[PDB]
Design a protein around this ligand. Structure first.
Ligand SMILES: Nc1nc2c(ncn2[C@@H]2O[C@H](COP(=O)(O)OP(=O)(O)O)[C@@H](O)[C@H]2O)c(=O)[nH]1
Ligand SMILES: NCCc1ccc(O)c(O)c1
Lengths: 341, 277, 57, 235
């Protein structure tokens, strides 16, 4: 040859294959063979304990608070309703500028809520306002694509994910993108912050997940394996692992320190996509929302399917476990949220 | 006897089918909130409840009197004929509402989605049930209907209550469904224009099939009874109690067929499938 | 083309020099953190209805 | 204490009654998604509707025709892989597909994009309103005779003007044949595999056209009529 571009493509493939060899080098055993002697969790049949109604359209995002009692929900009717999940009372009902909201977050201090969507803007609302009605306080601009997910770090740091194949860390006060994360080819669809705020991973529509160092802005690890678009992602409660769900009707468990996939959760009677995933407090239960209106509960150690949560008139679009592990909520396109335990 | 046991089993099967179909509609409504969401479903629930009342209240006693030959419940039956008129009028009436309903939701889709709010739905359901109870019980308990227990309606009452309960609803239902036919035929011709342009009576048969099924089951099931109710007390050419009785059963038979013709939307089908399993 | 290739090669070299542990140990750590907290996960071990805010009044 | 329970209960009451008035409002608004290539008229159509009709470039516009509210939205800041933000519009009444009929070489791009929209997995019951926009420019190019359609579509040579054509008063038969040829290329896609679940309604429009509210109104009404028909198995 001679053209440095073909030599970089070649050296690229050489590095990817030395990396694949270094990955198969540490693949001595599988999690299933190791955990074949543990006892199964048994049939887990949780039931609807509450039903939260009010939304006029499909719910697209929800997030529990740190107190494990309140939660915020964003619907594509242009509303963002805050619920006291214990008493089913509504604490706030925030009308939204753009009705196509796709994400909503709950600040760990409980003072602020965030949300964004097809407007390419992340809007922060101060819940502890001092006069009249809760209204907009900040609005983070800069993305050239639709905002798909966002989660607070503290009362001033917030990370956003967008369809421009980038993630960004923002300082809410100054409004500047304090850090930019680039490298994804397709739309970034979901992000999950580690329990210690130091790193975070992101799953994109290029069938890849990437682990990013928040403070340094570099991609530390890239995991692959899904055959199509990644729709959801979340950290293992330990902080060194995460699970992904994709449109190919499969869940995959990756480890951070081992740097490869550990286990795959699928059934040949399950053909629909997957919209949301989340672990329990101990990481033993993995809940995943499928398009077939159901939610499957997998045993994160045996790859066996353990329980089901049926009851919904449309695709379950989101779910989330409380910070105390007491219950899980599910939002679907039938305009209802349901608490389960 | 051979004929008697056959009437018994056929009548028991008819009642069980009525009860099963209508309780299935009512259950598919109560269990699934995505069926209670609309308003046309409100009217379909009203219809199913009326026919379920027909079954449980009115049909079996007449079947027992048909088997045994003598009316054993006695003073009840004063009430029964009143009950009969009510349940058998909340059914025909309800069809009328549902028919106008579909029409109003096809001739003015925007106005419909705006004005038909569940308050108007409840008002229409209220008119049907209250018209039924009024026109049925009040002339019975006041003994205006009288000119084995004689359920023979008075000569003037037959024609009057008949005109209301059937002939106002059949006129309204025929008007509505012929209008819906005009509209569907227009749209079919229009859709056919585009496809012929692209390429350059199956959909008509589908329209005919559905309108014919609805109106033809209703008419061929109820109409003889009401032209009889018309002719008989005036002349009672004339007929006997057994023939009048089979045409009565035709009337209550339509209450059996109503679920399959008015509650087989795809979602209703799937709700039944997840119910029975 | 040429800039994204230099960035892709340096990124792959950066991703290559991470230190990985054996999968047997990574799974042993996952099982240990799981069963070490298994008894405190109400969704796994059901909590009596007295201390359940969603089953009580 | 218990007072705070009654305050929370009346907070729930004020919320739910606000949501009931909002439910009626949301129930009566017909969402219309504006889609289409660039160098088209989407942003000009939204700008014109905000001007000529009472209308709330910007992504959205809210306008009323005959006491019927609409909310038309055009997405501008995205990429070309519309495969994922499209599922936010699976319930819209109709998609307004705008096509630059005067752009003889970007027309194949419009045909391919229309095919991908018409066959989308999440748009199976969504009817498309086809605006063959910029008809005045098309007449300009046809009368000018510098760029002829046969050089880009050799089929146009054997094409015959349909016998059902309804030309407006004062139109050269060459322009009529050209615009009805573009019409039938898109109708051949809409009438292809498609489904009996949804249809395409072509209209020749220009950015200065004023009845471009009556067209969306009429066609939303036909889509709803046919939804109500196919619901009762009539049509
Ligand atoms: N001459 C003419 N120009 C038009 C017409 N419709 C739109 N345009 C042009 O389109 C331009 C607007 O940009 P536009 O393509 O709408 O941005 P987009 O919404 O992203 O596609 C304007 O400068 C108009 O001149 C039309 O009917 N006639
Ligand atoms: N078996 C129904 C008999 C009946 C029902 C309604 C009437 O109005 C009526 O005159 C008679």
């Amino acid at each position: 040859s001679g053209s440095e571009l073909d030599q970089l493509r070649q050296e690229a493939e050489q590095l990817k294959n030395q990396i694949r060899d270094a990955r198969k080098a540490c693949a001595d055993a599988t999690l299933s063979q190791i955990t074949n002697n543990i006892d199964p969790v048994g049939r887990i049949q949780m039931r609807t304990r509450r039903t939260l109604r009010g939304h006029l359209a499909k719910i697209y995002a929800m997030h529990w608070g740190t107190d494990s009692r309140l939660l915020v929900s964003a619907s594509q009717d242009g509303k963002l309703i805050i619920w006291d999940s214990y008493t089913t009372n509504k604490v706030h009902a925030i009308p939204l500028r753009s009705s196509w909201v796709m994400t909503c977050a709950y600040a760990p201090s409980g003072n602020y809520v965030a949300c964004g969507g097809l407007d390419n803007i992340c809007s922060i609302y101060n819940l502890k306002t001092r006069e009249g009605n809760v209204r907009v306080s900040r609005e983070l601009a800069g993305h050239t694509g639709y905002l798909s997910c966002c989660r607070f770090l503290d009362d001033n740091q917030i990370v956003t994910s967008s369809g421009d194949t980038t993630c960004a860390l923002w300082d809410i006060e100054t409004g500047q993108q304090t850090t930019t994360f680039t490298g994804h080819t397709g739309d970034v669809m979901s992000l999950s912050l580690a329990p210690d705020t130091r790193l975070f991973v992101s799953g994109a529509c290029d069938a890849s997940a990437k682990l990013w160092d928040v403070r340094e802005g570099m991609c530390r690890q890239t995991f692959t394996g899904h055959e199509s678009d990644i729709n959801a992602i979340c950290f293992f409660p330990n902080g060194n692992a995460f699970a992904t769900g994709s449109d190919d009707a499969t869940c995959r468990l990756f480890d951070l320190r081992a740097d490869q996939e550990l286990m795959t959760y699928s059934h040949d009677n399950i053909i629909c996509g997957i919209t949301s995933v989340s672990f329990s407090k101990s990481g033993r239960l993995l809940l995943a929302g499928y398009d077939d209106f159901n939610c499957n509960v997998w045993d994160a150690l045996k790859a066996d399917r353990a329980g089901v949560l049926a009851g919904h008139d449309n695709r379950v679009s989101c779910l989330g476990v409380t910070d105390d592990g007491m219950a899980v909520a599910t939002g679907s396109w039938d305009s209802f949220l349901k608490i389960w335990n | 006897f051979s004929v008697r046991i056959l009437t018994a089993c056929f009548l028991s099967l008819l009642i069980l089918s009525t009860l099963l179909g209508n309780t299935l509609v009512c259950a598919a409504v109560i269990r699934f909130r995505h069926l209670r969401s609309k308003v046309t479903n409100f009217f379909v629930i009203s219809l199913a409840v009326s026919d379920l009342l027909v079954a449980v209240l009115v049909m079996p006693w007449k079947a027992v009197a048909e088997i045994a030959g003598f009316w054993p419940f006695g003073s009840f039956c004063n009430i029964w004929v009143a009950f009969d008129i009510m349940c058998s009028t909340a059914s025909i009436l309800n069809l009328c509402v549902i028919s106008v309903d579909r029409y109003w939701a096809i001739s003015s889709p925007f106005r419909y989605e705006r004005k038909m709010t569940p308050k108007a739905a409840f008002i229409l359901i209220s008119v049907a049930w209250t018209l039924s109870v009024l026109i049925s019980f009040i002339p019975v308990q006041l003994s205006w209907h009288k000119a084995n227990c004689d359920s023979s309606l008075s000569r003037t009452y037959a024609i009057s209550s008949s005109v209301i309960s059937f002939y106002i609803p059949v006129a309204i239902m025929i008007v509505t469904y012929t209008r819906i036919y005009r509209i569907a035929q227009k749209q079919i011709r229009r859709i056919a224009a585009l496809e012929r342009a692209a390429v350059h009576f199956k959909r008509e048969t589908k329209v005919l099939k559905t309108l014919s099924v609805i109106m033809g089951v209703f008419v061929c099931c109820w109409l003889p009874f009401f032209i009889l109710n018309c002719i008989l007390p005036f002349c009672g050419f004339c007929i006997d109690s057994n023939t009048f009785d089979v045409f009565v059963w035709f009337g209550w038979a339509n209450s059996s067929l109503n679920p399959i013709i008015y509650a087989f939307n795809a979602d209703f089908r799937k709700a039944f499938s997840t119910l029975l399993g | 083309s040429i800039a994204q290739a230099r960035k892709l090669v340096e990124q792959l070299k950066m991703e290559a020099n991470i230190d990985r542990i054996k999968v047997s140990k990574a799974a042993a750590d996952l099982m240990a953190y799981c069963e070490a907290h298994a008894k405190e996960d109400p969704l796994l071990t059901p909590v009596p209805a007295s201390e359940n805010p969603f089953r009580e009044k | 204490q218990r007072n705070e329970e009654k305050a929370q209960r009346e907070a729930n009451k004020k919320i739910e009654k606000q949501l009931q008035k909002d439910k009626q409002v949301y129930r009566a608004t017909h969402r219309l998604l504006l889609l289409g290539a660039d160098n088209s008229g989407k942003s000009t159509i939204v700008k014109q509707m905000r001007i000529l009709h009472g209308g709330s470039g910007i992504f959205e516009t809210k306008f009323q025709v005959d006491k019927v509210n609409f909310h038309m939205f055009d997405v501008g800041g995205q990429r070309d892989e519309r495969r994922k933000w499209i599922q936010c519009f699976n319930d819209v009444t109709a998609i307004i597909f705008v096509v630059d009929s005067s752009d003889y070489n970007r027309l194949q791009e419009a045909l391919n994009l229309f095919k991908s929209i018409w066959n989308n997995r999440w748009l199976r019951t969504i009817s498309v309103i086809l605006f063959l926009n910029k008809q005045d420019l098309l007449a300009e190019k046809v009368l000018a005779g510098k760029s002829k359609i046969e050089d880009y579509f050799p089929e146009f040579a054997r094409y015959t003007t349909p016998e059902d054509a309804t030309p407006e008063p004062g139109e050269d038969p060459r322009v009529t044949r050209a615009k009805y040829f573009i019409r039938d290329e898109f109708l051949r896609i809409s009438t292809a595999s498609g489904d009996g679940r949804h249809y395409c309604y072509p209209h020749f429009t220009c950015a200065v056209d004023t009845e471009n509210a009556r067209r969306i109104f009429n066609d939303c009404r036909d889509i709803i009529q046919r939804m109500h028909l196919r619901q009762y198995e009539l049509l």
